[PDB]
Design a protein around this ligand. Structure first.
Ligand code: CL
Ligand code: CL
Ligand code: CL
Ligand code: CL
Lengths: 432, 432
């Protein structure tokens, strides 16, 4: 009955996921530029600059926590576990509530300077837009419910990163298990991902979303050092996931689910990350402003160690508090400062290999998206599409598959699966 | 064990496809810039230069017509109606026989300035490489055979056009019908296609395969003219399909299968394309040269009529003779010439629209792929991502989905489906 109307509506999904995505990116960039642009006006007084860097980030984050805790308490956090749990018919898709809250409260949170990603809002906005097109064009059956939820979600990562290949390979490796799939479902997801990057590339004509320049090569007597980098990253992956879920119920003890104490904790958390945008800008922000600085070596090793310790204690504070933001971009810059700190000691230990710390940074950039969030194939092609260094593929397979092999040996679920089974275990804690 | 094995070999075949397609593209460009590098070296005798432009491209074509007729007769033509019949278990995949002569016979056919594409001898080289690494690794299953044959075929377009989105979308519209598809079959197709653009973007760092230079945006009040462009292409497409298969019948009358009369006819055809690649370079060649010159508005209206009738003669003279080469790039250069002629008779008839002949050439470029091959979604994502004009997506849909409306209404089969059902008619002719 529906051979081609589901493929027309998938292009309608992919058009809106790519128009509501680049309006989100232009809204967090307009808010970031006029929050840093509000500090150059009061540059004469130093304590007045710190006040309006705290308060302009606090009331932007308090605007984001209030919209989540009052109107849609599922837009908090990433939103990828809420779409991953909606494709299994376990979580509801309330697009009339999450779409004005993940957009406008996700702006205020990300444009306020919190250490959170563009991809968490965009994947959940895309999952709700695909339900919105499904509801305003009333389609029957679960055959169209889940193929319009798969697109939008896959079209969201395709517009949050300009990654059409990594957007489809995300939902293959994360949300859809080993079964048999209709070719119309595969066709409709492709039209939505294609329409998502087209609406990105209409309004964003730049290549190299992470622009580092074309770096050195990795010779084959060097590729064993990227296997050591997978051992370091594959151990930290499950350790970081214990810290994410360990602070989700540690910051939950500050409040008790009280909305007036959640937004006052999120305004102190959001105001601290706007305070750390003028004092030390390398320890806050979404992370994408740090990846090209850390790749082509500008830091020391004492500063690069300090950046890593200060960024893990702000990635945890931003994500686990219940703010509408992603976790890829805080962890892409977290694997870049760890790959550079590994790359800076590999130059000194092995001067006969003619090494470069930037090749270990681009290799280790998607090695935390392989160990912590166990999607190694998605994390490799994402870094290759963002950072156009395609000659660094054989170090990326060595460090991306050696990370996800030891992430299973040490014992670790994916992060979006571990968050989802902690929200499914609590929605069944009221329904006895 | 079993499923992770064929995912590893997908990266093996896609690396091998993307390296054999780069070596094919660099080898065709080496043979082209050696007979045209020795072109100005004979700038003292113009009748003798017309002889060493004929004969240097004739014996290059005679090497390509003899490798096909002696060794692998299933390597003559495109090769897309030999992998798409191989996925239906009707044609054999002789990777020890086709893969040498689709490479070395294609270096002399395409390097001799003939009107053929690289997408023909890279899909059949691609699908044979996936069968090549099925027998050297000794795999047993039949769907594990089909997911390695479709992996390299989809990696063939992705390393010929640098279009991974069009490589996946081509084996859904044209090569595979609707079924229940295993997830690792979809995953292994994705791995070989991303690994071939990785191998293509290591060597070729071009941001666009065709550079026309940011043509204008088409307003909504001008958007009805792309419907007439698809109406015109949707009629000519079925007419061009009967000319491909009619010149196939007409040229199989100089020779009844005779290998001496095949390669002497193929050397006169291939020597003429080296002859009319010096005195009139826009009538022969593969076609990727005059696409930036057509959309720039260089040719006049009486010249574009001369270019169209001469390129539609040398496309049927070359493809329907039996030469190992594709027909996409001759038909992208046939829709660009017909699209420029439409945009130049509409920029004078409608001065109120402030039109441009380039927006009708880019839109009309993939309107003959939607009419002859009848793969509309592939041809839209082929023209853009080769020409970075994503702001013409709404023109390209109307001359896209809308040129397949009159392609079916006129009574036109797809081209590769019409060659395959004609090849399989000769297959069951002698044996039955
Ligand atoms: Cl979350
Ligand atoms: Cl996320
Ligand atoms: Cl053919
Ligand atoms: Cl072809």
């Amino acid at each position: 009955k529906t051979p081609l109307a589901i493929l027309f509506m998938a292009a309608v999904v992919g058009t809106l996921v790519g128009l509501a995505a680049v309006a989100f990116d232009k809204g967090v960039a307009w808010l970031q530029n006029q929050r840093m642009g509000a500090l150059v006006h009061t540059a004469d007084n130093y304590p007045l600059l710190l006040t309006v860097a705290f308060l302009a980030s606090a009331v932007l984050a308090m605007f984001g926590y209030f919209l989540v805790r009052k109107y849609a308490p599922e837009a908090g956090g990433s939103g990828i576990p809420e779409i991953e749990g909606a494709l299994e018919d376990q979580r509801p898709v309330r697009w009339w509530r999450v779409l004005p809250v993940k957009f406008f409260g996700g702006l205020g949170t990300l444009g306020g300077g919190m250490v959170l990603g563009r991809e968490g809002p965009t994947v959940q906005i895309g999952g709700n837009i695909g339900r919105m097109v499904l509801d305003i064009f009333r389609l029957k059956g679960d055959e169209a419910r889940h193929t319009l939820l798969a697109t939008g979600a896959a079209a969201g990562l395709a517009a949050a990163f300009n990654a059409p290949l990594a957007g489809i390979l995300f939902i293959i490796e994360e949300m859809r298990p080993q079964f048999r799939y209709t070719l119309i479902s595969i066709k409709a997801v492709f039209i939505g991902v294609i329409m998502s990057t087209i609406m990105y590339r209409i309004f964003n004509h730049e290549v190299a979303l992470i622009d580092v320049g074309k770096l050195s090569d990795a010779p084959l007597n060097t590729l064993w050092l990227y296997l050591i980098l997978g051992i370091i990253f594959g151990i930290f992956g499950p350790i970081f996931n214990k810290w994410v879920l360990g602070m989700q119920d540690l910051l939950h003890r500050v409040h008790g689910g009280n909305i007036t104490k959640w937004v006052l904790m999120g305004g102190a958390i959001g105001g601290l990350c706007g305070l750390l945008g003028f004092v030390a800008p390398a320890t806050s922000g979404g992370g994408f402003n740090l990846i090209p600085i850390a790749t082509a070596g500008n830091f020391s090793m004492g500063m690069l160690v300090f950046i890593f310790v200060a960024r893990v204690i702000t990635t945890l504070l931003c994500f686990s508090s219940g703010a509408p933001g992603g976790i890829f971009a805080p962890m892409l810059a977290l694997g870049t400062v760890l790959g550079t700190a590994f790359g800076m000691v590999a130059v000194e230990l092995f001067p006969q290999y003619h090494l470069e710390a930037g090749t270990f940074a681009i290799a280790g950039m998607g090695a935390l998206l392989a160990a912590s969030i166990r999607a190694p194939l998605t994390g490799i092609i994402l870094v290759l599409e963002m950072t156009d260094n395609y000659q660094l593929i054989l170090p990326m397979i060595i460090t991306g598959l050696g990370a996800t092999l030891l992430a299973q040996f040490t014992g670790g679920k994916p992060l979006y699966s571990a968050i989802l089974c902690r929200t499914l275990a609590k929605q069944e804690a009221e329904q006895l």
